[PDB]
Amino acid sequence: MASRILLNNGAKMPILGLGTWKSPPGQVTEAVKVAIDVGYRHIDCAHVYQNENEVGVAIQEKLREQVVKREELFIVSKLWCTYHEKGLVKGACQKTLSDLKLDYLDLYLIHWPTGFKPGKEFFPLDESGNVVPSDTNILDTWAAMEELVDEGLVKAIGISNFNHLQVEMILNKPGLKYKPAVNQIECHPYLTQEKLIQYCQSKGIVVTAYSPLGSPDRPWAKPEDPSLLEDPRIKAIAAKHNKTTAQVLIRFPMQRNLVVIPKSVTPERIAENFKVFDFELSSQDMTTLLSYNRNWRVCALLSCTSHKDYPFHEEF
Numbered sequence: 001m002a003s004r005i006l007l008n009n010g011a012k013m014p015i016l017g018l019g020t021w022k023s024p025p026g027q028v029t030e031a032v033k034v035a036i037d038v039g040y041r042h043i044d045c046a047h048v049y050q051n052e053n054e055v056g057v058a059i060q061e062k063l064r065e066q067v068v069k070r071e072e073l074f075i076v077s078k079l080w081c082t083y084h085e086k087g088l089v090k091g092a093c094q095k096t097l098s099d100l101k102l103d104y105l106d107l108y109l110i111h112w113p114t115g116f117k118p119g120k121e122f123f124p125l126d127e128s129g130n131v132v133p134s135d136t137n138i139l140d141t142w143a144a145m146e147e148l149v150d151e152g153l154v155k156a157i158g159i160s161n162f163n164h165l166q167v168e169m170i171l172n173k174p175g176l177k178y179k180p181a182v183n184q185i186e187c188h189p190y191l192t193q194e195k196l197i198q199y200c201q202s203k204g205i206v207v208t209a210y211s212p213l214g215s216p217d218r219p220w221a222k223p224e225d226p227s228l229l230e231d232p233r234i235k236a237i238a239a240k241h242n243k244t245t246a247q248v249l250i251r252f253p254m255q256r257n258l259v260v261i262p263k264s265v266t267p268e269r270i271a272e273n274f275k276v277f278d279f280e281l282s283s284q285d286m287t288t289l290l291s292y293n294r295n296w297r298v299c300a301l302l303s304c305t306s307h308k309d310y311p312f313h314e315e316f
């Protein structure tokens with residue numbers, strides 16, 4: 001298992017990164033410092049997570065300490081839905097750069113295909129509770145992303161939570177200048193994504209798997225929900241390999257040629273989650289884990305189901 005995957009912009013992306021959604025701002029600086037100290041070279045960020053300044057403090061310390069060179073880091077962030085207007089994209093990127101204390105991002109993603117009305121609120125509502133869309137076509141948002149490459153602010157651009165028809169719309173865009181490098185999507189044994197992954201990979205787009213542990217700290221968890229970390233069938237595979245269930249859940253996407261971004265703020269777990277380059281799941285293990293698919297989502301963007309660009313009505 002090589003540590004990096006080649007992107008269609010010619011750069012290499014570490015297959016294991018640290019997630020930062022829900023990482024408290026008072027804990028994420030130490031989490032990122034620990035992660036870099038124990039070998040992580042890829043951090044997954046977003047403006048909407050509200051903790052990029054604190055992530056950036058850690059990155060900057062480790063650069064200043066000469067623990068790692070900037071060239072060796074792969075920093076990802078994402079354009080939030082209220083910044084899809086073409087005239088807002090550059091400023092959104094620059095705010096993220098300023099908070100992360102970087103001069104460039106390695107990868108900048110359209111966070112969701114749904115654009116929202118711009119303003120202070122990340123989920124602007126009408127008086128009846130619906131999210132207020134923006135009329136900016138996503139292909140115009142893509143052109144604005146391409147401009148960031150051509151200004152040196154980002155090395156690569158990509159997409160997140162795009163279904164296969166939306167990926168295809170980008171690939172068919174009149175005058176397309178840069179193909180997406182990555183589509184970052186939810187993926188784990190309960191949402192295995194075979195069709196979307198094969199489509200993206202067949203077009204040279206690398207897939208990043210989010211919520212690989214099933215996001216046990218997601219805010220809307222309910223007792224009746226399935227639980228990957230507690231699934232006896234997955235625990236049994238881990239026991240057979242003398243690894244933890246989380247380690248199996250991280251290794252699984254790696255063997256599908258995916259990038260994977262488990263989140264933790266717990267130092268011992270940050271280190272545990274990186275110790276996944278010393279064992280292999282068998283093809284039978286892989287087929288068995290794939291067989292657990294449920295089409296079950298952590299992130300269904302439930303406030304936006306009427307948005308014209310809502311991604312999860314289509315089969316894939």
Ligand SMILES: NC(=O)c1ccc[n+]([C@@H]2O[C@H](COP(=O)([O-])OP(=O)(O)OC[C@H]3O[C@@H](n4cnc5c(N)ncnc54)[C@H](OP(=O)(O)O)[C@@H]3O)[C@@H](O)[C@H]2O)c1
Pocket residue numbers: 018019020021022044045111160161184185209210211212213214215216217218229244246247261262263264265266269270272273298299
């Ligand atoms: N593009 C998108 O729309 C999108 C959406 C969702 C997520 N993401 C990205 O993907 C990342 C990962 O997804 P996620 O945060 O939803 O969930 P996740 O990585 O599946 O799970 C994180 C949870 O697992 C716990 N955990 C971590 N390592 C563990 C271990 N070894 N043993 C037991 N528990 C462990 C964490 O606890 P502690 O932190 O307390 O240790 C936290 O509660 C996000 O942080 C974000 O960067 C992107």
Ligand SMILES: O=C(O)CCCCc1ccc(-c2cccc(O)c2)s1
Pocket residue numbers: 021046048049219299
């Ligand atoms: O899209 C992504 O990458 C993950 C979600 C990011 C935006 C959010 C939606 C709902 C969130 C939330 C809901 C209730 C409580 C709480 O503390 C947070 S955060």
